[PDB]
Amino acid sequence: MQIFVKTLTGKTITLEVEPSDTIENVKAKIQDKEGIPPDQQRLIFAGKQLEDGRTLSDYNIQKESTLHLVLRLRGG
Amino acid sequence: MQIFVKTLTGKTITLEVEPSDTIENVKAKIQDKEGIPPDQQRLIFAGKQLEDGRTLSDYNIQRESTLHLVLRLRG
């Protein structure tokens, strides 16, 4: 299935994913397109922050769902 | 000859058809009533998905037989 990710530029990309893919798997796909390391990635769906060990199906993310990418910087 | 077509929502459609009508013809009749393009329709009879070039009689679909209309996720 296809989902969309709104990236750090505001641009929107399309990812080919499987329903049981983990959020970690999605983050690995996103780095390929955007150049943002998975560790610096936070993913938001329907306002909620997604957890790396959980899957798309866990959050009922279906085709044409849009995820929002937010930068996670630590420290400072 | 009439047949029934049940949708996902439980809605029952009643179609006037002929025994030698193709499945393509049935999809066209469903398009007239429901507005759904034939390419998005899957028709099932007694659990089997019907092929568009074959006829109702090919499948032993008779007066008062019931088909199930399954829709192709648009996209």
Curated annotation (Swiss-Prot), chain A:
Disulfide bonds: none annotated. Residues 1-76 form the Ubiquitin-like domain. The record marks 68 as: Essential for function. Changing residue 65 to A: Prevents phosphorylation in case of mitophagy. Impaired translocation of PRKN to mitochondria. The record marks 54, 72 as: Interacts with activating enzyme. Changing residue 72 to K: No effect on ADP-ribosylation. There is a cross-link at residue 76 (Glycyl lysine isopeptide (Gly-Lys) (interchain with K-? in acceptor proteins)). Changing residue 65 to D: Phosphomimetic mutant that binds and activates PRKN. Phosphorylated at Ser-65 by PINK1 during mitophagy. Phosphorylated ubiquitin specifically binds and activates parkin (PRKN), triggering mitophagy. Phosphorylation does not affect E1-mediated E2 charging of ubiquitin but affects discharging of E2 enzymes to form polyubiquitin chains. It also affects deubiquitination by deubiquitinase enzymes such as USP30. There is a cross-link at residues 6, 11, 27, 29, 33, 48, 63 (Glycyl lysine isopeptide (Lys-Gly) (interchain with G-Cter in ubiquitin)). This is Ubiquitin. The gene is UBA52. The chain holds residues 1 to 76 of 128 of the full protein.
